[PDB]
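pasting input
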Amino acid sequence: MQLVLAAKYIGAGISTIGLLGAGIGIAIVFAALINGVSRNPSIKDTVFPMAILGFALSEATGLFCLMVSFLLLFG
Amino acid sequence: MQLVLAAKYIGAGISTIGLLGAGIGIAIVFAALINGVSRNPSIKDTVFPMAILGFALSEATGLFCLMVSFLLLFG
Amino acid sequence: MQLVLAAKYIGAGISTIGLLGAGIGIAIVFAALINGVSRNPSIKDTVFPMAILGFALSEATGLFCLMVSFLLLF
Amino acid sequence: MQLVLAAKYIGAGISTIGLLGAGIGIAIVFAALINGVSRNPSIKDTVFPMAILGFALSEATGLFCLMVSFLLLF
Amino acid sequence: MQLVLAAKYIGAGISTIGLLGAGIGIAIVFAALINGVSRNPSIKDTVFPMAILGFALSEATGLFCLMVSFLLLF
Amino acid sequence: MQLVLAAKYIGAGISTIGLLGAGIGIAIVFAALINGVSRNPSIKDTVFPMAILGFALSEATGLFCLMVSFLLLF
Amino acid sequence: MQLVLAAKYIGAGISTIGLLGAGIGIAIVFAALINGVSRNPSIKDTVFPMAILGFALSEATGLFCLMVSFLLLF
Amino acid sequence: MQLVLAAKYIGAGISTIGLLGAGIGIAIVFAALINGVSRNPSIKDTVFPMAILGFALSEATGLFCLMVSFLLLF
Amino acid sequence: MQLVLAAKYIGAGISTIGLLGAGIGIAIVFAALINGVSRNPSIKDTVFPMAILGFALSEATGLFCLMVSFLLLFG
Amino acid sequence: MQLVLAAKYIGAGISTIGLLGAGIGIAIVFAALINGVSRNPSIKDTVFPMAILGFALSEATGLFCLMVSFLLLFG
Ligand SMILES: CC[C@H]1/C=C/C=C/C[C@@H](C)[C@H](O)[C@H](C)C(=O)[C@@H](C)[C@H](O)[C@@H](C)C(=O)[C@@H](C)[C@H](O)[C@@H](C)/C=C/C(=O)O[C@@H]2[C@H](C)[C@H](CC1)O[C@]1(CC[C@H](C)[C@H](C[C@@H](C)O)O1)[C@H]2C
Ligand SMILES: CC[C@H]1/C=C/C=C/C[C@@H](C)[C@H](O)[C@H](C)C(=O)[C@@H](C)[C@H](O)[C@@H](C)C(=O)[C@@H](C)[C@H](O)[C@@H](C)/C=C/C(=O)O[C@@H]2[C@H](C)[C@H](CC1)O[C@]1(CC[C@H](C)[C@H](C[C@@H](C)O)O1)[C@H]2C
Ligand SMILES: CC[C@H]1/C=C/C=C/C[C@@H](C)[C@H](O)[C@H](C)C(=O)[C@@H](C)[C@H](O)[C@@H](C)C(=O)[C@@H](C)[C@H](O)[C@@H](C)/C=C/C(=O)O[C@@H]2[C@H](C)[C@H](CC1)O[C@]1(CC[C@H](C)[C@H](C[C@@H](C)O)O1)[C@H]2C
Ligand SMILES: CC[C@H]1/C=C/C=C/C[C@@H](C)[C@H](O)[C@H](C)C(=O)[C@@H](C)[C@H](O)[C@@H](C)C(=O)[C@@H](C)[C@H](O)[C@@H](C)/C=C/C(=O)O[C@@H]2[C@H](C)[C@H](CC1)O[C@]1(CC[C@H](C)[C@H](C[C@@H](C)O)O1)[C@H]2C
Ligand SMILES: CC[C@H]1/C=C/C=C/C[C@@H](C)[C@H](O)[C@H](C)C(=O)[C@@H](C)[C@H](O)[C@@H](C)C(=O)[C@@H](C)[C@H](O)[C@@H](C)/C=C/C(=O)O[C@@H]2[C@H](C)[C@H](CC1)O[C@]1(CC[C@H](C)[C@H](C[C@@H](C)O)O1)[C@H]2C
Ligand SMILES: CC[C@H]1/C=C/C=C/C[C@@H](C)[C@H](O)[C@H](C)C(=O)[C@@H](C)[C@H](O)[C@@H](C)C(=O)[C@@H](C)[C@H](O)[C@@H](C)/C=C/C(=O)O[C@@H]2[C@H](C)[C@H](CC1)O[C@]1(CC[C@H](C)[C@H](C[C@@H](C)O)O1)[C@H]2C
Ligand SMILES: CC[C@H]1/C=C/C=C/C[C@@H](C)[C@H](O)[C@H](C)C(=O)[C@@H](C)[C@H](O)[C@@H](C)C(=O)[C@@H](C)[C@H](O)[C@@H](C)/C=C/C(=O)O[C@@H]2[C@H](C)[C@H](CC1)O[C@]1(CC[C@H](C)[C@H](C[C@@H](C)O)O1)[C@H]2C
Ligand SMILES: CC[C@H]1/C=C/C=C/C[C@@H](C)[C@H](O)[C@H](C)C(=O)[C@@H](C)[C@H](O)[C@@H](C)C(=O)[C@@H](C)[C@H](O)[C@@H](C)/C=C/C(=O)O[C@@H]2[C@H](C)[C@H](CC1)O[C@]1(CC[C@H](C)[C@H](C[C@@H](C)O)O1)[C@H]2C
């Protein structure tokens, strides 16, 4: 069992790597929101909900990584 | 049976790394949606369904990673 | 036989890393489609089958990863 | 128990890798804010709250990594 | 020989990683095709064969990875 | 305890990897400052503090990596 | 000798990773050729030889990787 | 003591990976300087000290990697 | 000595990773050559030697990786 | 003495990975030089010395990797 526990711990750590994707992706979405509103202020009310949807969908990939991490850590 | 279990757990953590791809990719699609709508608001109803398609296709690559991850963790 | 079986399962996990390329590449294609249509709506019918071809070819690289992953798993 | 201890230290180091996404992502947000303001100074007040939200959400991904890190260390 | 067979299976999984390069590259080429055609529809017949060549050459890098991978698996 | 000490030293090296994110991020912010000022010199006093904030926030992600690294080394 | 054999198989898989640079690099070259031609069809004959040179030099990096790979396998 | 010493040397190698961030980030800063000057020559004296600040701050992240590498080596 | 030889072989394989940098960098330089000449044909004779210098300098990073690889393989 | 030597050799291969950074970075600088000269040929004598500086600074990060690599291989 020392070997299995050790594996859960290294695996939990590895499972967080993919969070770099959400980190960068979330930022890409908000960068486009900022550049889109700067170029066309009147479009704000239209593109802001799209940025929220995009954030949420990118963020969810990170959710899936963290879920696995916690399953290894505790489950 | 120790060694095999330990391998399943390390392998499961490694399987989540690919999700970073869907995390960046989902964001790339929504950035384009936002930038395209900002430049040409009239195109919104044409490009929004394209963004949905692109996001789902990108997301599915991530699904494949998480599928292998779950096959390892439980299967 | 445990060590070999263990190696199969580590290998199957590693074999999915490459799917990040399709995740990004599929998105790159659709981004080009959206921006190309927004700039020139009249071109939509010409570039749409191009985006479908480009995404399917990109996705295929990731499927070859998954194939090796399943060869290792099963 | 020395093996499990060793594993926690290795895992804690690995758990910091994902913070590179936050370091890059925060910068992407601030780059857009700077370029957006330079192109249209008058939009500053409108886009600044968006940059705060975007950087906060991007940085959160790095906090989750560090949270796993500190769970393993302590 | 549990060591040798284990090495073949882990080696085979590692060998698929580079396929991410084709996944991204193929997409980069098709994105430029799409953006090129949107900007200048009349150039379609000229740039399309160029995109086919580019995709082919980028895809081949992936083929080589898969070849080393299959060598190790069999 | 040769295993535990070995794990601390390998863990510490792995913990510096994420500093690449700050290295790239800091540069992204200063590049936008430079491009922003070149395009609109009059905005310099407005965007400069924004670049300082952005650099600070991106650099902090690196600080955290170095902190885990130093924890493991000592 | 089984350990050294195992190592050659692992090393051969690792040696294919660098081919992702070729897959991306070839695509970058063809993207520029497509966009360059779309913007200025009349330059085609001048830039095409440049794209051949650039892709050949980029692909060479992947051949060196594969060369190391095949040295380890055979 | 061999296993610990071995871990120090593996760790020292791993500790250099992060220097790729400064390699890229320094280049990002100079790229912005060149393009900003080419577009607006008159701004050179304003943006040059910005590029020096930005590069030195980016480089520093890599130096912290090297520091950990030398702590491990010596 | 089995352990040292095995290490030379895995190390030689690892030492090729950095060649992805030359692969991408060379391509970046030639992409700029192509885009620069397309936008301004008259600058060709001026930017072409710069592209060669840039190719050579990027390429040399790859040289250094391969040199280490061959030192491990044979030296 | 086996184990330590083996570690020096694996560590030396790992130390070259960072060179990918200088490989891309050198290329980024020369791409900007080419694009800037193409847009404004008159600026060549001003931006060429900047490219040299940027390339040398980027290259030096790679030098640091190769330095650790050589310290491991021989030192
Ligand atoms: C399922 C995918 C995501 C769902 C998104 C839904 C978006 C719709 C939208 C209206 C959204 O609710 C808004 C934009 C929002 O995020 C609200 C709730 C936040 O309070 C925003 C505005 C906010 O201010 C942020 C900056 C807040 O201050 C900080 C503390 C939160 C950051 C954060 O990342 O929270 C996440 C995120 C919402 C994250 C988002 C999940 O949820 C949390 C909570 C549950 C787990 C732990 C996940 C793990 C995860 C890996 O994805 O993190 C929580 C913990
Ligand atoms: C075939 C692959 C994808 C399918 C896409 C289909 C797209 C069509 C389109 C109409 C889409 O269904 C719409 C826009 C949609 O996403 C719906 C379901 C959402 O509820 C939208 C409206 C929404 O509000 C989202 C953004 C919501 O705010 C937050 C909380 C959802 C986050 C999320 O990550 O959802 C995903 C995603 C849809 C993700 C998308 C899967 O599905 C989920 C649910 C099923 C598993 C658990 C997957 C795991 C996966 C790895 O593949 O994650 C779930 C978990
Ligand atoms: C500097 C090194 C590169 C040489 C480039 C030379 C470029 C000149 C240019 C005129 C080029 O030859 C043209 C574009 C070209 O590739 C011709 C021959 C092809 O017919 C093109 C048009 C073509 O249709 C391709 C897509 C063909 O259909 C498919 C099957 C081949 C793809 C491919 O990537 O091949 C490579 C590549 C040329 C690859 C590129 C190597 O070479 C091949 C063939 C030679 C050996 C066998 C190497 C080693 C090897 C073991 O990886 O692989 C081969 C295998
Ligand atoms: C380096 C040589 C490449 C050749 C390129 C040739 C280009 C010419 C061009 C006219 C081409 O024939 C056209 C566009 C084409 O691909 C045809 C055959 C396809 O049917 C197109 C139209 C198509 O619809 C695709 C998307 C099809 O729907 C799906 C199922 C195929 C996806 C796919 O990735 O195929 C590859 C690819 C052609 C791939 C291309 C290899 O070949 C396949 C089969 C052989 C091995 C197993 C490779 C593995 C590889 C890692 O490189 O996958 C096959 C399996
Ligand atoms: C969603 C999660 C993020 C919260 C963001 C909140 C944003 C709102 C916004 C007004 C923000 O608070 C502003 C810009 C801000 O950061 C203020 C407080 C700072 O004073 C800014 C202006 C500042 O000067 C920075 C550069 C300061 O000088 C330096 C020392 C701090 C940098 C830094 O990155 O701090 C982080 C970050 C805010 C980091 C970001 C977390 O929070 C800190 C502080 C709280 C705990 C301790 C966490 C956990 C932690 C263990 O990594 O780290 C801290 C540690
Ligand atoms: C997250 C908190 C960050 C704080 C940001 C504060 C920004 C405010 C801003 C006005 C700042 O004070 C100015 C621009 C500044 O950096 C001053 C102090 C410098 O002297 C500037 C002008 C300077 O010339 C730099 C390039 C100096 O020449 C060189 C030797 C310093 C490089 C460097 O990277 O310093 C860092 C950084 C400020 C770094 C910044 C941390 O702090 C140092 C010292 C503390 C630890 C060891 C960190 C480790 C880190 C991984 O995060 O490195 C120190 C060592
Ligand atoms: C020191 C750094 C580089 C020096 C560059 C000098 C550039 C000046 C410029 C005039 C240059 O000589 C020209 C552009 C050039 O490359 C000539 C020689 C080539 O013949 C070009 C035009 C050419 O056609 C290429 C596509 C040729 O067809 C193919 C077969 C060669 C590809 C290649 O990568 O060669 C390299 C490269 C020149 C490479 C370049 C080294 O050298 C080689 C030979 C020595 C070792 C084995 C290195 C290893 C390396 C990792 O860098 O590979 C050789 C093997
Ligand atoms: C401080 C770090 C850098 C110093 C840069 C100084 C720049 C000032 C500028 C005047 C520069 O010296 C000029 C442009 C220059 O590069 C000279 C020396 C070259 O001979 C130029 C003109 C040239 O023709 C080059 C492109 C030539 O075609 C090819 C064959 C050289 C390739 C090459 O990689 O050189 C490098 C580089 C200059 C590289 C640059 C080091 O140096 C070399 C030689 C010393 C070791 C072996 C390093 C290892 C390193 C990891 O750092 O590689 C050598 C090996």
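fyi Chain B touches chain C through 51 residues (CB under 8 Å).
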